[PDB]
Amino acid sequence: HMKVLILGAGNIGRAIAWDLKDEFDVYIGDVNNENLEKVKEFATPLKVDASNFDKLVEVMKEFELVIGALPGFLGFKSIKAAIKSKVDMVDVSFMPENPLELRDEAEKAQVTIVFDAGFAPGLSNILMGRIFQELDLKEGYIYVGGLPKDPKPPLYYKITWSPRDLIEEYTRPARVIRNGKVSKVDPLSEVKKVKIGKFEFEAFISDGLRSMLETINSERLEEWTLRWPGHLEKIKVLRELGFFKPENLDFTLRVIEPLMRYETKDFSIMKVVGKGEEGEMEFFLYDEEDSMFSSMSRVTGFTAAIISRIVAENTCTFGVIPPEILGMREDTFRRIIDELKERGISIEG
């Protein structure tokens, strides 16, 4: 079993570790011990600060694969480290910067990096890429949400993944492709009711499309994030009052985060729609928290691990590769769907 290093022992990172524990000798580095304590049984913990770049690259030379599960602010650097250190990487962090900026350096260094390998982006992109190949795509829609099974006031949401990254969904523009071009909207500004199966949600346009903006050529492309009602209106007022400004964000989170940390199971819901000249395609996912992990962890984490296997297998070329590429080729797409099913994540359509 080859050596693998996962950066970050957060909820996502721990799930990736669990999934890969018997196929690789996995090492997971984090800066927080309490989190590392959680993983000693299945991975070998390392005290690592991804913050320190020259130091990080040194740790990297030992391994043949790195998987990134850091907070978003730290991701671009880790990618940089991997490339300098010449190790293949699969990254899940919700980084603000664009990984494709690093494409040349990656190609030259002959390593392959797959970024945004989570639930959405990630599996989200992969399904779209598939639709993109199978259809002469005109319009694409993604509806996605990680939600609490039993929502509760006052915020009706359960925190399952990094909150700093989460607030960003509300705080910056969301881009879409309208009339064939990229366009920006205020996410908070247009919220609508959508019903999917039994559920009634409020949906807002979000900035999850990411690489798909350049990658998927269609007239219309939008991703909508799903929420229980009552959540967004409250968030909007906070934003309006400046509570999300960087100066106060830490303080505001301290207040609100506890409200969103109550006991409930969580679920994952995704719907992907593709419209073409002759036909439409629709994919659907519903997942729930298992005994060990939240759905968000399962879906984001297992998807990354599955992708990691694909990379370790040498399937892919050098450079920085968007996750939707994986969708576009049949062998890779099918494998992903199959592995997901193995793990109880059933994607339909």
Ligand X SMILES: NC(=O)c1ccc[n+]([C@@H]2O[C@H](COP(=O)([O-])OP(=O)(O)OC[C@H]3O[C@@H](n4cnc5c(N)ncnc54)[C@H](O)[C@@H]3O)[C@@H](O)[C@H]2O)c1
Among 18, 76, 157, 243, binds a copy of itself (CB under 8 A): 243
Identify the burial level of 120 via C-beta atoms within 10 angstroms of its C-beta, where 0-12 means exposed, 13-18 middle and 19 or more buried: buried
Give the residue among 333, 312, 303 at the shortest CA–CA distance from 118. 303
31 is in an annotated binding site: yes
> Could you tell me the smallest distance in angstroms from the CB atom of residue 74 to ligand X?
6
50 is in an annotated binding site: yes
Residue 279 interacts with which of ligand X, a copy of itself, none, CB < 5 to 8 Å by class = none
Calpha distance 198→107 (Å, rounded): 47
> Could you tell me the smallest distance in angstroms from the CB atom of residue 113 to ligand X?
15
Q: Do residues 211 and 319 touch, judged by C-beta distance below 8 A? A: no
Phi, psi of 273 (to 5 degrees): -120, 135
Residues 256-285: x where in contact with a copy of itself by CB under 8 A, - otherwise, as a string: x--x--------------------------
Give me the sheet containing 88-91, strands edge to edge.
Answer: 44-47, 25-30, 3-7, 65-68, 88-91, 112-114, 319-321
Among 237, 292, 344, 346, binds a copy of itself (CB under 8 A): 237
What is the DSSP code (8-state) at residue 96?
A: S
Among 53, 141, 161, 286, binds ligand X (CB under 6 A): 161
Give the residue among 255, 269, 294 at the shortest CA–CA distance from 154. 255
- Residues engaged in binding ligand X (CB under 6 A): 8-13, 29-32, 35, 48-51, 69-72, 74, 92-94, 116, 118-122, 161-162, 165, 296, 300
- Residues engaged in binding a copy of itself (CB under 8 A): 153-155, 233-234, 237-238, 240-243, 248, 251, 254-256, 259
Annotated binding site for NAD(+): 11-12, 30-31, 49-50, 70, 94, 119-121, 162, 165
